């Protein structure tokens, strides 16, 4: 019943400007996953495009190779989580002080 439009690595390349060879490494690094990893032809959805765009932005920003980008993005996701928690704790302290 739920439908996800998929497309080839060639289309992924067209939408991101990242070569098929580099996209293949990005897959190998576990940054994106084809719908059937074992299938003879990899197919991707729009979320793969979103992930690659974020990775390209970080590559431009920090100039890391793809393995370093993968780790950096994971650690930045953790940084954002800790920051959200920090803010919530700060809000609770303010709420206490104001009661």
């Amino acid at each position: 019943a739920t439908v996800t439009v998929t497309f080839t690595i060639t289309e992924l390349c067209l939408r991101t400007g990242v070569s098929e060879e580099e996209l293949t490494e990005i897959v190998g690094l576990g940054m994106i996953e084809p719908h059937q990893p074992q299938a003879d032809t990899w197919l991707f959805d729009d979320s793969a495009v979103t992930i690659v765009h974020r990775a390209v932005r970080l590559r431009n920003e920090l100039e890391l190779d793809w393995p370093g980008i993968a780790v950096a993005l994971t650690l930045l996701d953790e940084n954002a989580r800790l920051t959200r928690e920090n803010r919530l704790l700060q809000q609770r302290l303010a709420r206490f002080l104001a009661h």
């Binding site: 490494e25 190998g28 690094l29 576990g30």
Partner: peptide
């Protein structure tokens, strides 16, 4: 080269 990419993925995980 392929095994090293896999190590990278799994070490990150």
């Amino acid at each position: 080269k392929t095994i090293k990419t896999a190590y990278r993925r799994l070490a990150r995980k």
